[PDB]
């Protein structure tokens, strides 16, 4: 299915040894997993997930 981030428009590279599984889904960062609680987007400075 191609390892993809739970975010609707996010597809950053996810690493198994640090995979953030939240509610059974994988995310690229702890930010996407928690729907960006600290208001912090993901490490990708060009990504627009949750922004748009
Ligand atoms: Cd993103
Ligand atoms: Cd990302
Ligand atoms: Cd993400
Ligand atoms: Cd996100």
Question: What's CA 49's distance to the chain center, in Å?
Answer: 8
**How far apart are the CA of 7 and the centre of ligand 1, in A?**
7
Q: Tell me the domain boundaries of the chain.
A: 1-52
What DSSP string runs through 35-47?
Answer: TSTTS---S-TT-
Rg of the chain on CA atoms, in Å:
10
Q: Are 12 and 29 in contact (CB under 8 A)?
A: yes
Q: Are 31 and 10 in contact (CB under 8 A)?
A: no
**How far apart are the CA of 32 and the centre of ligand 1, in A?**
7
As a whole number of angstroms, the distance between CA 31 and CA 41 comes to 6
For residue 47, give Cα distances in angstroms to 22, 24, 29.
20, 23, 13
State the structure-solving technique: NMR
């Amino acid at each position: 299915n191609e390892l993809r981030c739970g975010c609707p428009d996010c597809h950053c590279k996810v690493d198994p040894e640090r995979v953030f599984n939240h509610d059974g889904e994988a995310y690229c960062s702890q930010a996407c997993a928690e729907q960006h609680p600290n208001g912090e987007p993901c490490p990708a400075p060009d990504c627009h997930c949750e922004r748009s």
